Nucleic acid binder design. Structure first.
Length: 71
RNA sequence: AUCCUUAUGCACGGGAAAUACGCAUAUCAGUGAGGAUUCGUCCGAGAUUGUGUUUUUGCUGGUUUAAUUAUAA
């Protein structure tokens, strides 16, 4: 419910990130770090791991892209 | 005044390599290159593209016989 509410009003709270990535994602991001401040405190190398479901030994994942982390 | 730490320059002495060292009126790159993870995160400067030489650069060493002149007539 919170996440869906953020996606509606997010263009007000974070107009830039919803412009680059889009609101459906930025809502998920901000939704994770639980604010704009706490998400801007995050280094950029830690941002790509957010949507990553989980890592487990039998998953068997090497992409053709070379992406280790899909967020 | 002695003693010590870091960085840089010159240098005696001792090693290792030359699939190794460079170059660019060229593209990006701490305003994040390239990776790593135990999935929470963690490390933090090169990567592309073209090219020169690379069983080799410079320098060296070895091997393939003077003049003068003497007899008793």
């Amino acid at each position: 419910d919170i996440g869906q509410y953020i996606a509606s009003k997010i263009s007000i709270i974070a107009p830039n990130v919803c412009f680059l990535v889009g609101p459906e994602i930025a809502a998920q991001l901000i939704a994770h770090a639980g604010g704009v401040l706490e998400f801007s405190r995050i280094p950029s190398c830690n941002i790509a791991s957010i949507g990553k479901n989980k890592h487990l030994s039998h998953e068997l994942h090497t992409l053709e892209s070379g992406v280790r982390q899909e967020g």
